[PDB]
């Protein structure tokens, strides 16, 4: 009963102002931190920034700080993101994120309807197409030891990344028991007992240990 | 390696029979500190919320637990309104929040079994009654024994937390000890389980007399 | 967040029938480190010790659990010799010790009650059997189901660890699901409890038919 | 079935060597650390030292460092304590202790056979000093430490003329066989031992124990 509406896609050419609106339904807009993530075709997801509407405080990524602009509107429970210095080199789809969390930094619960015309880990193996009936293992290792503060997302093509495993050990409800994650320290493994064409998508690694938050290159199946 | 907190859902007996649902948001293993922990509540519609009773007390092994219980509307919960418990502690860097709401999974009606033990040697004064509830989904359930149309205290009957069946559903066993005077007063004992999947009135009950 | 370890006692089924009682000393909450943990064993009398099989394994929540299982002679245990498990860990300043021995408290014979569930729609072939073990001391106990004098795997029957009753003793519930072809093969199913207090041969059993 | 015997009381004169022998029976002598505690008239029983028989290493209290000497013999399963430079104030009873333990320091399991008579920085505060018998009435005993110790505290029961008996370890759980009337609870600097109902069968001195830091200290105690 919690969905978020991002803004309709719009035409762009280099050097024009852009505004995209992320709307929140199903949860109190003021209480949860909102976040902005950037996925560029051919590049793993990278942190773009975050904003708190309760206090109207704002945080920015190292490179996007001056380019990006963050604001929110409390009355209608809508928040929008604006950006400048646009280049076609910066062509990417931006997925708006919420911050459901335990303690400081954590996984995200978010929808994804926005497209615009650094303590990072290693994503491996890079890509593997469908192979039915064989157990499939995806490996993620981070530059700095992460302990167990890692998360697994699944983005089916054209939709929002859906959280699969939080903290690499335990799976979110509704997920079939075949998906299982394990690991410690720097190394982590996601094991699918049996691989079925029913679930095919890209799987991205998440690290919340330190700032900025990082995502793996991903593995598509 | 961090403090965690758990949130519970209202029991079906407090929902359908008592009509007063109990929502519990609790925090655990908090290292005792002079920092005050603030627990706030809200609902998804962002519209007014009832005030929460707050109870804070220390625990035996020395870790601190603070709990807050919020009264909820019965229809508000059955419709599916999502509730947010916010915990803020100066020890934590950012605020912590937990959310809950009605489950939308498949529903299985509870199967009720009331069994009585034959009079066996050495215990003429005390007798035992057992109840088995089988194949119910989701895991929310509340079970009770009524003697002479009265609500017996929770302590009187020992129950088991739900465990997944070998097949489909969950099963709960409960054990009751009746005194001689109890069946001396009245001989009908009915075991009834309240569950969201249950119908007509979220009640399934079976009674059998002490002797068949 | 100091690390702890537990030692367990032999089950009555492994003690009286199998004739191989095994005591297990294991450590939990192990913060992963490259330091290897060494576990040694001795008995109080300084009399011979059999080598213990050692198995170290990771778990889902990421904590390491290391166990050492030592086979013990039944007579040595019935005599009451106390055994000591010594665990040494490079992180800990001094070694840790755990001790175990036979229980000398009052002993109460287990009461077994076997119940059968009525045939319900949609599962005509498969039925459910329940067993209640009552008023036994001490809380050492092991339960089994026999179908035509065959031991069904431990996994097949879901059982409950003993918990103290309101009065004196403990109660255990176990639930088994019978196949159609199994009661087609043989129709009497026996719930058996193995316990130190049980006699003549530490077994108490009662049987139930699937349907009359 | 674990007994350890200390030496029969020995007559001594000022300036004379004294030896006390602790023998261990019922458990492997090599594995457990042994400990020595001194109870002096006007002084709560306080840490005197400890020894590891496996490696023969030794630990000492600030005041007893030079005077006392600890030794062990593996074959005899005995440990000895000897000291010189005796003073008239140093007349006291010496209890030899075992160290069942998790990590550095913890509770003790011990017997009672040491008497010394010669011809002539964390403190534990235990209160009230004394409360006489009133059967059936709840009795509450409080123990306070200057520096917060967490839960590293223990409660002992010493009936007069016998060994302190370990009652509660870590202030929460009771050792088996003890009646459920005894209960402990507390944290930080304050701790309370509560006897739900008081019985003449159990009358004794109850001593506070500290495992948090060195040296280990004991409260003055409360007898009834
Ligand atoms: C992370 O993963 C670990 C993996 O082991 C979990 O560890 C379990 O929990 C604790 C240690 O963390 C262990 O507790 C001990 O369990 C014993 C039970 O073992 C018997 O029963 C099991 C059924 O669970 C049988 O399978 C087995 O054969 C044994 O016969 C108890 O006997 C111990 O008793 C002590 O605690 C009880 C409270 O239960 C007290 O009342 C007693 O006085 C006594 O002091 C103890 O409870 C447990 O054994 C571990 N699992 C297993 C399978 O052994 C962690 O729980 C988990 N944590 C998180 C956060 O994920
Ligand atoms: C020392 O302090 C106290 C003892 O005085 C102790 O607090 C306990 O903490 C644990 C967790 O750290 C609590 O366990 C919880 O219990 C609730 C009760 O239902 C469970 O629900 C929780 O787990 C499940 O919750 C759902 C089912 O209810 C499941 O859907 C879910 O997936 C979980 O499996 C959780 O286990 C425990 O309740 C408290 N104690 C009390 C009395 O409440 C503390 O842990 C002790 N030790 C430490 C190191 O802190």
Residue numbers in the entry:
A (entry chain C): 1 to 117, 144 to 247
B (entry chain D), C (entry chain B): 334 to 545
D (entry chain A): 1 to 120, 144 to 247
The authors write:
IgE is known to interact with two major receptors, FcεRI and CD23/FcεRII4, which are involved in different immunological processes. Here, we report the crystal structure of ligelizumab bound to IgE, revealing that it recognizes a distinct IgE epitope only partially overlapping with that of omalizumab.
Ligelizumab interacts across the IgE-Fc dimer and favors the recognition of IgE in an open conformation different from its FcεRI- or CD23-bound conformations. This primary contact is formed by ~15 residues of the ligelizumab VH domain with heavy chain complementary determining region 1 (HCDR1) residues W31, Y32 and W33 forming key contacts at the center of the interface. The ligelizumb VH domain contacts 21 residues of the IgE, centered around Q417, R419 and M430. In this cross-dimer contact, ligelizumab VL residues interact with the IgE loop containing its conserved N-linked glycosylation site at residue 394. These contacts likely contribute little to overall ligelizumab affinity, but the cross-dimer interactions would restrict the conformations accessible to the Cε3 domain. Third, the binding of ligelizumab across the IgE dimer restricts the arrangement of the Cε3 domains into a conformation that is incompatible with FcεRI binding.
